[PDB]
Design a protein around this ligand. Sequence first.
Ligand SMILES: Cc1cc2nc3c(=O)[nH]c(=O)nc-3n(C[C@H](O)[C@H](O)[C@H](O)COP(=O)(O)O)c2cc1C
Ligand SMILES: Cc1cc2nc3c(=O)[nH]c(=O)nc-3n(C[C@H](O)[C@H](O)[C@H](O)COP(=O)(O)O)c2cc1C
Ligand SMILES: [Cl-]
Ligand SMILES: [Cl-]
Lengths: 122, 122
Amino acid sequence: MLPGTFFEVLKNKGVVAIATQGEDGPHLVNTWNSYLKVLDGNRIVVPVGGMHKTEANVARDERVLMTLGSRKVAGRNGPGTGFLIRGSAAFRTDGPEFEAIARFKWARAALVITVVSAEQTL
Amino acid sequence: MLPGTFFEVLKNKGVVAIATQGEDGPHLVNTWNSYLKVLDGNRIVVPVGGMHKTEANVARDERVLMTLGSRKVAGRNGPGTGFLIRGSAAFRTDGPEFEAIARFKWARAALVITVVSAEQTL
Ligand SMILES: Cc1cc2nc3c(=O)[nH]c(=O)nc-3n(C[C@H](O)[C@H](O)[C@H](O)COP(=O)(O)O)c2cc1C
Ligand SMILES: Cc1cc2nc3c(=O)[nH]c(=O)nc-3n(C[C@H](O)[C@H](O)[C@H](O)COP(=O)(O)O)c2cc1C
Ligand SMILES: [Cl-]
Ligand SMILES: [Cl-]
């Protein structure tokens, strides 16, 4: 399950980064800390406006990496912390996962990350 | 020439993300907005403490992606913006490139990103 300090990071503002595998190299896109919706102990849902290249990548290789953090949350050995999340991704345009982020009217889809690991890297 | 909005983001707090190509998929690591040092029109230096896997990746494939942003800086459609940087990476342990981040007493090296493109993605 996702750890307590991760939820503390979500309560603070910041830029989330999401890396996928493309045909010719990695691709890297963003969301905001505040936009992540956690379901159960292992699903993180992201509202999708663009992410067209990201979606194409995920369709061929479901594996994603995600990082996020905050200066305002104590880490393992000082002020500030962050996490590296590894998981499998899928895009949804309806159902409970889309409904989880449907408050964002600009969302054309939901990016659903099923987390396999969460490492506190700072 | 990095744009003024990019410099504004650097004046605000946040988590920077750096993606490299690994042997089995992408790799994704972090620094802080305030740690970045801009050398000139297109070089950004990051203090390196860990980044051992990142360094190994860069030796195989110099191409890197970097994202950063801030809720506090104006984007195209209201508050909040960020950037995708595409370029090539190198590691240095001396010279002006290292001196640029030498204030970080823990730095084992400097990661120098030569920027090919900077895109405001919000
Ligand atoms: C700080 C920040 C937050 C962003 N938030 C989102 C978001 O929540 N959803 C989204 O689809 N794109 C968001 N974007 C834009 C994406 O990072 C990306 O540029 C866009 O979705 C296109 O993705 P693609 O290159 O995979 O086509 C954000 C960008 C930044 C800098
Ligand atoms: C918010 C945040 C800031 C970080 N800042 C640095 C940094 O400035 N330099 C560094 O080497 N590692 C930093 N780290 C740790 C790296 O992201 C990474 O986990 C570590 O360097 C190992 O890199 P590697 O997986 O390439 O071996 C930071 C981590 C977080 C979450
Ligand atoms: Cl946020
Ligand atoms: Cl910062």
